[PDB]
Amino acid sequence: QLVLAAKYIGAGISTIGLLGAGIGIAIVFAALINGVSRNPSIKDTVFPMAILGFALSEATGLFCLMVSFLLLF
Amino acid sequence: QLVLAAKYIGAGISTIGLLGAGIGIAIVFAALINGVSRNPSIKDTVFPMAILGFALSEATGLFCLMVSFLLLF
Amino acid sequence: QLVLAAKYIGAGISTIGLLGAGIGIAIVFAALINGVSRNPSIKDTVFPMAILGFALSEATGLFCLMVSFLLLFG
Amino acid sequence: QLVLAAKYIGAGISTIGLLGAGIGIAIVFAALINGVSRNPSIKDTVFPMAILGFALSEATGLFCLMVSFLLLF
Amino acid sequence: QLVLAAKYIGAGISTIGLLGAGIGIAIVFAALINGVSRNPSIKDTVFPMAILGFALSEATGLFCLMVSFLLLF
Amino acid sequence: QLVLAAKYIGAGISTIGLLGAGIGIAIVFAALINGVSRNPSIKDTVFPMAILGFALSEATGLFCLMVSFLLLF
Amino acid sequence: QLVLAAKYIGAGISTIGLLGAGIGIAIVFAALINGVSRNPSIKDTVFPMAILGFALSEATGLFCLMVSFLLLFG
Amino acid sequence: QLVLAAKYIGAGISTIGLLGAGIGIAIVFAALINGVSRNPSIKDTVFPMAILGFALSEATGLFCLMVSFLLLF
Amino acid sequence: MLKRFPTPILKVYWPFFVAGAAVYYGMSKAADLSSNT
Amino acid sequence: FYFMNQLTYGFLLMITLLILFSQFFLPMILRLYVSRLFISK
Amino acid sequence: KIKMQLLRTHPNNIKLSINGIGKDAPTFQESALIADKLLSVMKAGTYPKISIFYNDPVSSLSFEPSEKPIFNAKTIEQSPSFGKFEIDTDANVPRDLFEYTLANQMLT
Amino acid sequence: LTTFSLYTIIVLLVITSLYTLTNNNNKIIGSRWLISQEAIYDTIMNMTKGQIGGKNWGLYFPMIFTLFMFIFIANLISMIPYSFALSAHLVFIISLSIVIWLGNTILGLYKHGWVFFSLFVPAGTPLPLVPLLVIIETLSYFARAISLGLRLGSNILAGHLLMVILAGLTFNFMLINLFTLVFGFVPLAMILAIMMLEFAIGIIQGYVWAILTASYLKDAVYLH
Amino acid sequence: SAWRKAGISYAAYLNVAAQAIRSSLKTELQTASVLNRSQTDAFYTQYKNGTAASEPTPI
Amino acid sequence: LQSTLDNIQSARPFDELTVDDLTKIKPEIDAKVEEMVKKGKWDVPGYKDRFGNLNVM
Amino acid sequence: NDESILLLTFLGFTGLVAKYLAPAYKDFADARMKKVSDVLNASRNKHVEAVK
Amino acid sequence: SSGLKLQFALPHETLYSGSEVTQVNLPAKSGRIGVLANHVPTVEQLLPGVVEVMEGSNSKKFFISGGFATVQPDSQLCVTAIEAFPLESFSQENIKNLLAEAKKNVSSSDAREAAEAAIQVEVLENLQSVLK
Structure with a gap:
């Protein structure tokens, strides 16, 4: 039971690289x-x-989203 | 059971990436x-x-929304 | 039973998602x-x-807070 | 017994969002x-x-503080 | 099964620095x-x-994502 | 069956620290x-x-990356 | 056993402090x-x-690194 | 093991605090x-x-380093 | 309309092609050795 | 599994495009621009 | 004399009529006040270009009212080689450079 | 037969036709449809002679005009109801990444040869400090493959397969419910946004792939 | 200092500063031209379209 | 001059003349165009001095 | 269904493009057409003047 | 050219003309401009401060009530000030305390006049400050 949810947790954790990329892209736009x-x-x-x-x-x-997807599916 | 609620926690974790969109959405206005x-x-x-x-x-x-939704529904 | 604990913890973790909208409006006003x-x-x-x-x-x-509220009440 | 412990820990974690306001009102006044x-x-x-x-x-x-207080009680 | 679960956990942990990498690179472009x-x-x-x-x-x-890569397979 | 698990977890978690250098080389470049x-x-x-x-x-x-891989190998 | 396991996990996690080193290097050099x-x-x-x-x-x-070095050491 | 487990994990958690100094001193020097x-x-x-x-x-x-120095001993 | 002009990629793009052939060979070998599938 | 089914089968177009466009595609624009240069002189 | 000559051609051209400028040596404060009034009269700073048809006495009298350009608020910041000397957004260099260029040119 | 051949068939039928058929009779006037090439090729040459400036500009500029369009066309299958840019597998970027990096090392080894040890240190850090600089130059050369390999690939794959998640989740935005009205009809509006995102990301990523290729190639084609 | 809001121009501000700085000095420094710098007899009468030189107020 | 002008005042088909037919009218156009791209250079000195390159829009 | 939402969104995206991108591409094509037309016409009437 | 040249030629009487120096530190409008040598291409409107023009010899200090110092790429600092000042005549006590206060009488004028004289309100304090 834990093994399956492990992938879900790993994807959730790896999927937090969105914020910094968004900040940088906004910086470039600014x-x-x-x-x-x-x-x-x-x-x-x-x-x-x-x-x-x-x-x-x-x-x-x-x-980052893709690397999360590789654990998401 | 042991994986669904973990998926809920993963959805919440993926939701915490909204800070990048938030910071950028007003850095642009700045x-x-x-x-x-x-x-x-x-x-x-x-x-x-x-x-x-x-x-x-x-x-x-x-x-963030998509990741949370795939982990929350 | 642990679903409640997981939902509360996930809502608390997602309760960091609005920080960007916090200091963001700060920079905008600045x-x-x-x-x-x-x-x-x-x-x-x-x-x-x-x-x-x-x-x-x-x-x-x-x-992001609606994501938590869905894990808070819904 | 676990539900109350989780409520307390999640309330502590939800208090992290005070940092953003502290920096943000500070930026505005700055x-x-x-x-x-x-x-x-x-x-x-x-x-x-x-x-x-x-x-x-x-x-x-x-x-964030209101959500944390609601979760703590 | 714990080792595979933990490999997933670790691969979820490496992929956070990509946010900072995106921030820095897009700042440089900016x-x-x-x-x-x-x-x-x-x-x-x-x-x-x-x-x-x-x-x-x-x-x-x-x-940094390569760190998640090896534990992922 | 945990020392391998914890080594994997720590090796994955070690990737956060390189974000500073990754953003900083770009900062110096800027x-x-x-x-x-x-x-x-x-x-x-x-x-x-x-x-x-x-x-x-x-x-x-x-x-950081060298030490992260070394504790796994 | 478990104690050495947590020693390994903490050795991995403390390595996140290299971000401050990177940013300080950036500040000085830039x-x-x-x-x-x-x-x-x-x-x-x-x-x-x-x-x-x-x-x-x-x-x-x-x-920041010496602590992890002793962690692999003693 | 649990006693040494905490005396190592919390030690590592305190140990990353050297980042604040590595940024702070460099900022003043710069x-x-x-x-x-x-x-x-x-x-x-x-x-x-x-x-x-x-x-x-x-x-x-x-x-930050002081707490790790005490924790290890 | 359409012609075939003398495009030199035989003595110009030889190195990349040779490297790509080596890469395809390495991929074939890893299809049997590294990946074993 | 399915590795030797799109590797060469995909890179075939990559190998061929060098002989295809260079005598075929860019030749059109190059000749047109050169001829327009001739009218410009 | 320039006042009378300027009043002669176009009544709608003379925007100022100040007399007795040649009372004595060129004084820094008198010239500066004349410019500050000019920089305040009818938005002479908004005047995109202004040519100073000014005497160029070579040695004794080898001169006429020769015409020269003035670097204004817009022409100071965005000059093609203004990329060489940098300006600050907060310092508001362009306007001050236009005014001071008018000042030095007018006094000289 | 084989599905991969049918997948590549679209490219095999579009590459020759868009220049041998979209033009009226191969006329120099530049048709209204032919304005597309009339704008694209010139901007392409601008970067090609630009980024690869010098006598190295003519060495592979035609190769650039070729290699740029392959990935862009292959990823064009993203907006179909069953869209597939290389059957959700697309191992192709692997072919174009490391092989091109080895080609750069060959341009340093076939033309530049034994001088290949005189490029990793752009400015200084002599024998007292050369190894540290080489330690990151090696990482840069290694990761230049992944920067153009799977990067546009991941962008395309996500921008296309997000439609699968959109359908699977919001199948019931309005189909059979009392929520068919203005209440939830805003959630279904993300699909067109995803389409615009994928469409812009693919073209920009192909252009960026070309630019990164030029940047890597001129680095190993002009040693400082 | 307050040249930003409602003065005349940068020249006006620096010239008033010159007048004060000269006032922050005795006769052993202030030459004769400083007098004309203080005694400005330039009489400013802005004309008009109909040649209306209103009033030659000292500059 | 008179005949060339008579072959100019109405004999300059600037819209519907075949593009490659320029190499037919100009004997060195084909050779040089093959020569221009052949050695490797894909650019000419001001090939579009009076024309535009344009971006996507 | 699996291939339905994208099918319905294809026409929506196409209409969105037709709203702006169709006339935008038309304007971009026409501007270059007239520019090249004037560029060839000037060369033609200048060669005519050179013969003159 | 090595060193750094200064062109301090005010509309009253030119003081310096391209002379070499080791420092010309001055109080710019946005801050303190401590251009020692060469400097970089940037010219700033100046604020009333002290220009301790450090020549090859000692740094002469003169409380200067304004100007602009053009840092030309030739290490030339074209300081077209509005006033001149010595290292000794620009230093006094009574002349720097009563004159500004007497000028505060002029501040009793109407709004635009007070807006103008607000500069003079603190003008004399700078000289007594930089006199040392």
């Missing part, structure tokens, strides 16, 4: 917003890099 | 305010490019 | 106030954005 | 202080708005 | 974005350095 | 990025300081 | 880099003591 | 460094204050 306000013109030269970083974080964020 | 003060002009373009991130921010808790 | 001091001409624009940021941010804390 | 120092005059519209932010922030710790 | 919005000429001297740093920041979290 | 943006010529002088910081930062996570 | 950017002629000015500050933060992590 | 760089005159009026601040930060970490 810096993009700040660069847009301070530097309205050059915003295009960074918006591509902005999405590059946003994904560079959200991919690991979803990787 | 960036918007900083833009408005520093660049009242660029804030108009920023709001379209900041509201989306705020919505994109909520996905962090959305993963 | 930037709004610092900017309002930086420019009073943006004070009107901040509040129509501050309210939306605060409510939307606290919505996640409400969802 | 911004009020910084803005007053940088712009003395706007304190008139800030300190009231600072109280409003305190209400929107410390309410989180209030909700 | 800083590159802001610095570029500051000095557009600084792109050549900046982007390689941050691509070197943030990739390692996310790699730390991936290797 | 500061170097901003410094080059303000002063590109400081990149050459800070790269020695960059090595100094990276070595004193990543070692904590490296030894 | 702010030293920034100070070098702002006043490039401050690199030699601060190298004698800033490296010592990094060593102090690192020795704090050393004190 | 702050003095940046102050000296952005104020060369401030080094002479802050260096003894810098050492005093390093002491003022490491006190919490010494407190």
Whole structure:
């Protein structure tokens, strides 16, 4: 009985990496917003890099979800 | 019995990841305010490019919601 | 019987999920106030954005506490 | 006998949410202080708005404390 | 059966640092974005350095998940 | 049948400590990025300081992972 | 037996304290880099003591690691 | 075993407290460094204050290590 | 419309292809040895 | 189990795309851009 | 003399009519007050560009009212090579740089 | 027959057609549909010559224009009612990750060769400190595979299989109940959000895969 | 100090500071041009569209 | 000049001329285009100096 | 059912795209079309002037 | 060029012109600008403080009531102040205590006048403070 619930507990514990990834992604968005306000013109030269970083974080964020799923199913 | 309530506890544990969505959802507004003060002009373009991130921010808790639900129903 | 203990403990553990909505609104108010001091001409624009940021941010804390309440009463 | 022990432990853990409010009202008042120092005059519209932010922030710790008290009894 | 349960428990414990890895990496991307919005000429001297740093920041979290990996199989 | 179980649990739990180094290498990278943006010529002088910081930062996570795996093996 | 098991579990768990070491290393290295950017002629000015500050933060992590080392030892 | 089990587990739990000092002392050192760089005159009026601040930060970490020192014995 | 221009990937993309062949061989071996399935 | 069923069966397209697009796909845009450059001169 | 010449062409152009500036040596406070009044009259800071048709006495009289540009509040922060010298969001450098550039140019 | 062949058949039928059929008659004017390639290829070349700048730009830029689209197309099966990007297994990223890393080590070993020991230390940390720097350079090289391997893969897999959880849980959002009204109809609105999330994540992840490949390749193709 | 809210301009603030700093000094430092710095006879009469130089108030 | 203009004032099919037919009209277009991509460089000096590259939108 | 909710959501997502992404892609295609058209027309009328 | 050059040329009488120095620490608007050598490209409006211009010789201290010190990339500190001050004439007791207080009479004027003179309210305190 405990062996089965062990996977559920392990997934619940491993599934807590979402918050930091969310914080970082919001940080990237905030810096993009700040660069847009301070530097309205050059915003295009960074918006591509902005999405590059946003994904560079959200991919690991979803990787946490996947690693939880590997114990979830 | 011995696994279902453990799944409930795992759902609660996965729910504790909502802090990332919470912190980010207002860090985005903080960036918007900083833009408005520093660049009242660029804030108009920023709001379209900041509201989306705020919505994109909520996905962090959305993963929390899904994980809890799979562990709570 | 242990289901009650597990539900209470899970609700207590999930009772850490609203911390992000806590300090989040703090940072939001912080930037709004610092900017309002930086420019009073943006004070009107901040509040129509501050309210939306605060409510939307606290919505996640409400969802996490609803997850606990389902494990608290439901 | 286990139910009361669990209620006590869960009440202790649910008290952790006071940290967020303590930091958060602090951040709001800190911004009020910084803005007053940088712009003395706007304190008139800030300190009231600072109280409003305190209400929107410390309410989180209030909700956590109320839930913990409900669980403890 | 306890050993497998505990392997699951441990694999649930390693995957929390991925939050911090995402936070750090996305912060690095954020800083590159802001610095570029500051000095557009600084792109050549900046982007390689941050691509070197943030990739390692996310790699730390991936290797932390590697801790959960081995106990998972 | 617990010493193996507890070794697995502790080995899994040890992965949290590398989060500091993982975020911190990116923090140092961000500061170097901003410094080059303000002063590109400081990149050459800070790269020695960059090595100094990276070595004193990543070692904590490296030894953390090594010790985590060693108690399991 | 069980006592050694809990010794192993605690040795694993205490290793989470390396996060503070990492963040302190970040703070020292990053702010030293920034100070070098702002006043490039401050690199030699601060190298004698800033490296010592990094060593102090690192020795704090050393004190964090020594407990686990004795845990594997005695 | 349970007595030594707790005298080891709680010892490890107290042991991670050195993180607070590792951050606190580094923060004061970094702050003095940046102050000296952005104020060369401030080094002479802050260096003894810098050492005093390093002491003022490491006190919490010494407190943390103290409990493990007592717990082990 | 469609042509076949002289695209040099034989002496340009030879190294990656060789590495990929070694990887496929290692995968075949692990299909019998490391994974034993 | 099912390992030697999509490994090569999937990477076949990866191996072939090098000869496929390079003489096929990018050739179209390259020739079009070069010709438009010719009109530009 | 410049006041009379400026009043001659366009009545809707002269926004100020101050006399007796050439009372003596160029004084720092008098020039600074003239600028501060100019920086306060009709949002001359909002004037996107302003050309100083000013004398350029080479040695004795090799001059005319030569025209030069002024770096304003918008043109100071976002200059293409303004990425070199950095500004602070809180310090509000651009406005002060515009005002002080007007001050130094006017006094000189 | 075999299901894997049918899975790869979509790629085998789309790769040639989207350029040999979407264009009208291979005309230089750039059709309204052909505006898609007319915008995509130029941005691709921008990064290709950019990130791989130098004489190494022309070494494998066509390889980049090739390798970028394979994963993006393979993951395009995410929004179907029975969607499957490589039958929920997709061992393909394993093929493209470690082999490409070994190809980078070969570009350091076939072209750069014995100078391969002169790249892991970007700036300093000489013999008194080289091993510590190499200890993280090795981790970076090792994990660059996993950064482009399964990363876009995990993103795609989750963004697609979240629909399974959505159906299994909220089958009864409104089907047979008194809760069919405005009370619970908001829960069923997460499916389209998941679709938008998967759609953006897949394209962004393919672009990021290409960028990470270029970043790894130029690091071992230009030793500092 | 209070140049931010309701003054004239940065030049006005620094010039009043100059006047006070000179007042924080005796005749052994204040040269003659400091007198014109204090005695400003520039008479400011902002004109108008209809050439309305209202009043030549000393600057 | 007169004949070329007569072959210009109405004989410049700028919309519906075959793209590869440019290499037919320009004998070196085919050779150079094969030559341009052949050595390995996929870029030309200002191949789009008067055109746009564009992002996804 | 297992393959029902996604089936119903496919048309919803397609309509959502048609709401903005269809006209957006139309505008993006038309802008580049007119830009290239002017770029070729100027070259044509300038070669005509060069012959002149 | 090695060292650090200062251009302290106020609209009254130019004091320094590109002379070498070891420190020019001054009270900036956002803080205390202790630019010793080289500095970095950043120019700040200044607050009434002390500019102890540390030349190759001793650091002359002069309580300066404002300016902007342009830190040009050539280690040139263009300090276009508004006032000049000695290391000895900028140091006095009675002139720094009664003048500001007598000026507090001017503060009895209307609102805009008081808003202007609020700067003078604390102007003289800075000189007596930095005189040492």
